[PDB]
Amino acid sequence: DDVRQYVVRKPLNKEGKKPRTKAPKIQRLVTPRVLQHKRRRIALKKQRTK
RNA sequence: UACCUGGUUGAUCCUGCCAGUAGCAUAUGCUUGUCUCAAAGAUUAAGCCAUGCAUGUCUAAGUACGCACGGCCGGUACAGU
Q: Closest nucleotide to A23's CA, by C1' atom?
């Protein structure tokens, strides 16, 4: 399942500005950038053996 | 700049020390217009200390749900300060 969309949201209300909602940055999500760092980590091992 | 002078006797020649003469660095007295440098609670007590200051620190790159401030609307991890 997708871990996004199920994340809890916090509503903001005050007399001045419009309503808003907040949610946190997620800390173990395995995005494409995490996978890209894992690929270079093993490309450096191959280069040293050559 | 490798230098001496007064003082023992009625007078002389010596020994020998006292006093004078020049510099240096601590205190102290009288006196003082301009201008460039600049030592300064060591000496006695490593004695006793009111008050203030004398050591802090963030980048594109460890952790941002602070309505704290904010956008054109939306969290697509999640904007931005």
A: B65
